[PDB]
Design a protein around this ligand. Structure first.
Ligand SMILES: CCCCCCCC(=O)OC[C@H](COP(=O)(O)O[C@@H]1[C@H](O)[C@H](OP(=O)(O)O)[C@@H](O)[C@H](OP(=O)(O)O)[C@H]1O)OC(=O)CCCCCCC
Ligand SMILES: CCCCCCCC(=O)OC[C@H](COP(=O)(O)O[C@@H]1[C@H](O)[C@H](OP(=O)(O)O)[C@@H](O)[C@H](OP(=O)(O)O)[C@H]1O)OC(=O)CCCCCCC
Lengths: 621, 621
């Protein structure tokens, strides 16, 4: 009766959790299965991810207000400051929907699970501190300059995903060894700065403790490699040995040793993911069987209740129909535990179709089309005119560049661009009138060249409507999107398939890695605005300074300028110049900030990138 | 009779080849076993390696003659040019002993093996071309400037070793994939140099084909990261996207993909070495058994002939005595094939002894010494005064540096250096008078601190003989060797043993890796002297040039200046400056040379270094 219905909804939600690899640790009530099935629907989780993007996007429209044409200090516009309430309004709107997500996730799980899970307790702590800071910053009329509630904003991105949580555990185990290597690195610097100060000061670089300690720190990342040993190596040829040995021990041996420590915890990363996901699938279907054999009742289940329980799940139609036809043909005998676990192993095959074409009225007309459609060179006739188009844009690009840069002939360019895009629209039209509209949507390559033929047709016709033959600007935009045709050649990779397999493997596994990149940049940019906001002003410089080189755009005035400044220090080149600038402008203790950014970003994250490419290249072979 | 003796020498040379892991593919004659046993002796192979060092050392004393105080062009001495015949004389002396090595190695092996082995045929080819060039360069009175016979000199280093031959096979298999990645790299540069020339020229960097192609090539290795995008990013904030995407695809994705290709052929490198070496050992002892069972004869061998054949081999005395005592106790029954192969498995254990101490005459005196010798803190009392010594040298180093740099007090430094080295000589003396002279030689740490106490005693006493208390120079040399005492602290590594295990693993496996490094530097330096020998002369510069920065010491005038110039391009920093200098001074086509040096050294060899550290870190766990 009522227990009959409740075991159905118990067994629907268990199979649905066995497809999408979720654990079974939630309470089972009457109404809770409606709440659980609606919360894990894709329409509810998409607004949750859209919120997390909206929270992190608001740092572009805050009070420093990175909405400017440029980011120089010598010449830029006024900062558009918003009114008092709008950025406060959107933030408390999204902080409401984060409270709703926690309250649903606490209701669906146990209180004993709620007190033990550290991620849920940290979620409640961050929500109340962000709300306290919101009321404080609104009790004043938007006049608290530094807001702590923006620092906790990357925590919502971490708590939503699971691949970020797995990778942070992998860095947690590597930290006992990387500390010991960094200790050996600190011994390395302090010994050679005392050996250096005895040897040379007895330079421009070796004259003090903090000046000599910086010079060997910057040489450790080889940012001034010939510069730091010009005055030594010009006095005697033997002082080259001192700087050669420092960067063989330092940059070669110990920085590459630090990569291999991080790889040694990511060494079996993907195979643990398949073993855990298969273990979650087998536990889901077993719990579905064990509640279905105990409906009204040898051991086993009735297949009539199986037809009532595979009806109301979300699954592919090909997987739904093939599974239902197997169990329809099976008899009324009870299905054992082993027969149940083999039944749900039709979730391993993948089904692909493209489409069939449509028949025309004139039978010789459709015959002449399809015979001359399946040539396997009709596309290569498209590829021949594609290569012919790209070589023409290049060969005129060297012609218009060097000589007569003001006013050029530009006669035959419009002719070739006429005949090439006319050929593209015909190949667009002949393929749909052979296959069909749904058949042309079936191939993902054909969407790319079909859309590009459209946009090239709009820009060409508008070019031929203004003139007959800003003229240079329209031929600029026309030539730039023509070079996108060369991204049809690269989808033809027959011999070198390991490279194309790898780039497919990386982009499907960038949810974890980009998540840690975003969290690291978001914290360090926001600290940097609070420390170096207006410390660079401008109104015969030394030839290697921050001012001779016109580095005025690398400041921390707002959030967009901070992200590009922090990028230029991540690649380590010329970061001696940034250290010398902020030492002069914002005191001597600012070097703690740039050295910490070198550790978190350049050392750990780049070696975290190489470890992930090593694992995704070495998979199944 | 005579066949009795010949089977003995057959079975001596097979067991000796089964210890030192050499194959059995050589002919067996009467006199040839004397030749083979004398050629593989360590006194014959050491002069062969000393010759190979002597051939490669002669490039320092050749006609460019790198014997100068400095290597500037603004001020350096005259080149000491040697007479006509001496470098020719030493070369033909070593070319004689290479002919003797080939002739022995061809006599000991088969002619059919000689015609099939490619290394032996290349050996004969290089020897005759080096001899033809020697007679040609001596028919003129040392006036052929460029000598081809120096280019073939790294081939003798490759042919001698076997770890270099194994690693060159591993690079041979990776070359089909690295070419495909470099193709994808070349597509990457040519697309964005045409996209760049449309976008910006419609800069200082984007105005031509060869100027724009260099700018994106140098950005690929991030040698001008803020410099190439100053004028774009100052005009508009959106042009940062063009340069961010180029170095995410370029330097991040594709250069780290090129590491993982090389690692995928070194992935099982050391385990193949143990499996091949154990296979060479089992084949050696089996061939020893099969010729010993067929001396005069169920199956088996007589142990009396075993005592005659284990007598005349070279082996450790501990392994010799333990093996002989096992077979002495075994009876006169014939030893089977399985019993033979288990007999030679006492080459797996390793035996360590240090020494016993010696007794003194007064029994309470020796009792008081040894009781207060085994404290485990007598060494730490040495370690406490070691740390006390090193902190004192440091704390005065900041005191003498900053203020009053001309003439300093320098009063208490001689006092502390007196009492510390006096303590060291006593700890030197009390340990030998407790253990012994042979007991003090037993510990390799004690040789290091014992020798350092000696040299510190000579320099201190000579310091106290000139003065009472060049004075600053002697306190410089005294302070510098005192800092070597800190290399006693680092031999105490209890928690972080994986780091110390790895550095032990690297240095025992640097025969292969340094061999390819030496071969690469030797060829590219010698080509560079022949191309850019006198193209840099010197007699208001742009602020980022080769002349504003005083880079005058990075030339190719002789062999020592070439090696440091090629080093400064291996680390990729500021190599835009070198490209701009040699373009102005030695034509436009010189960039082919520096780009090829970027590929061989920076790309392949550094990734060859990371692959080897990855394999030696991941071994037995
Ligand atoms: C600098 C690096 C320092 C490392 C610090 C990070 C320490 C860290 O994450 O370990 C995990 C622990 C324990 O929490 P933890 O259990 O590790 O969190 C993960 C989730 O439980 C996940 O469940 P779902 O996502 O629902 O599937 C589960 O699969 C993973 O197990 P697995 O390994 O088998 O995949 C867990 O690793 O969680 C904290 O204690 C952080 C709490 C506050 C978060 C602050 C982080 C900013
Ligand atoms: C840029 C890289 C290009 C790669 C070019 C290098 C090509 C290359 O070495 O392959 C090996 C072949 C064949 O020669 P190869 O047999 O490979 O040479 C090795 C020796 O035979 C070695 O014997 P021992 O040293 O006496 O113990 C044996 O153990 C190795 O087998 P293993 O793999 O099982 O360890 C062999 O790899 O030898 C050549 O054909 C070069 C002849 C002229 C040398 C010119 C080299 C400058």
């Amino acid at each position: 009766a009522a227990r009959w219905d409740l075991c159905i909804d118990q067994a629907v939600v268990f199979i649905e959790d066995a497809i999408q690899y979720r654990s079974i640790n939630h309470r089972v009530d009457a109404s809770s299965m409606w709440l659980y099935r609606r919360y894990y629907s894709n329409v509810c989780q998409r607004t949750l991810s859209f919120t997390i993007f909206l929270i992190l996007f608001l740092a572009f429209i805050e009070t420093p207000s990175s909405l400017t044409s440029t980011a120089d200090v010598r010449y830029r516009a006024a900062p558009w400051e918003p009114p008092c309430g709008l950025t406060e309004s959107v933030e408390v709107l999204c902080l409401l929907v984060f409270a709703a997500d926690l309250s649903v996730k606490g209701y669906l799980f146990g209180w004993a699970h709620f007190q033990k899970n550290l991620w849920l307790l940290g979620y409640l702590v961050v929500l109340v501190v962000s709300l306290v800071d919101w009321t404080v910053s609104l009790s004043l009329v938007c006049h608290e300059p530094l807001r702590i509630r923006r620092l906790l904003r990357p925590f919502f991105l971490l708590q939503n995903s699971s691949m970020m949580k797995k990778t942070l555990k992998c860095i947690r185990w590597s930290l006992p060894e990387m500390a010991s290597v960094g200790l050996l690195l600190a011994i390395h610097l302090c010994l050679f700065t005392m050996f250096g100060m005895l040897l040379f000061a007895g330079l421009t670089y070796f004259q003090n403790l903090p000046e000599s300690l910086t010079s060997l720190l910057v040489l450790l990342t080889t940012a001034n490699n010939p510069d730091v040993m010009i005055p030594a190596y010009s006095k005697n040829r033997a002082y080259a040995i001192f700087f050669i040995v420092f960067t063989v021990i330092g940059s070669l041996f110990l920085m590459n040793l630090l990569t291999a420590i991080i790889y040694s915890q990511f060494r079996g990363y993907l195979m643990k993911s398949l073993q855990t996901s298969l273990f979650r699938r087998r536990l889901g279907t077993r719990a579905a069987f064990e509640v279905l054999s105990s409906m009204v009742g040898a051991v086993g289940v009735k297949p009539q209740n199986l037809l009532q329980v595979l009806q109301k799940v979300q699954l592919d139609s090909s997987h739904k129909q093939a599974m239902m036809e197997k169990v329809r043909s099976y008899g009324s005998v009870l299905l054992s535990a082993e027969e149940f676990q083999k039944l749900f192993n039709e979730l391993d095959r993948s089904v692909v179709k493209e489409h069939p074409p449509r028949p025309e009225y004139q039978s010789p007309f459709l015959q002449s089309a399809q015979f001359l459609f399946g040539h396997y060179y009709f596309d290569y006739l498209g590829n021949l005119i594609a290569l012919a188009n790209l070589v023409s844009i290049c060969v005129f690009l060297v012609l218009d560049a060097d000589v007569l840069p003001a006013e050029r002939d530009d006669f035959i360019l419009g002719i070739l661009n006429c005949v090439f895009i006319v050929y593209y629209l015909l190949e667009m039209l002949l393929k749909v009138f052979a296959l069909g509209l749904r058949g042309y949507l079936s191939y993902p390559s054909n969407v790319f060249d079909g859309l590009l033929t459209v946009v090239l047709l709009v820009l060409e016709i508008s070019t031929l409507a203004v003139y007959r033959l800003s003229l240079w600007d329209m031929t600029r935009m026309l030539n730039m999107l023509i070079v996108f045709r060369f991204l049809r050649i690269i989808p033809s990779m027959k011999p070198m398939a390991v490279v194309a397999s790898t780039v497919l493997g990386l982009v499907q596994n960038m949810r974890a890695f980009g998540g840690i990149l975003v969290v690291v940049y978001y914290v360090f940019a926001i600290i940097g605005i609070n420390l170096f906001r207006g410390v660079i002003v401008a109104l015969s410089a030394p030839c290697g300074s921050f001012e001779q080189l016109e580095y005025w755009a690398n400041n921390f005035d707002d959030f967009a300028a901070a992200l590009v400044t922090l990028w230029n220090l991540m690649v380590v080149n010329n970061w001696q110049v940034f250290l010398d600038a902020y030492r002069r402008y914002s005191g001597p203790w600012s070097k703690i900030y740039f050295v910490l950014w070198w550790l978190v970003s350049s050392v750990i994250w780049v070696n975290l990138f190489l470890a992930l490419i090593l694992e995704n290249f070495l998979h199944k072979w």
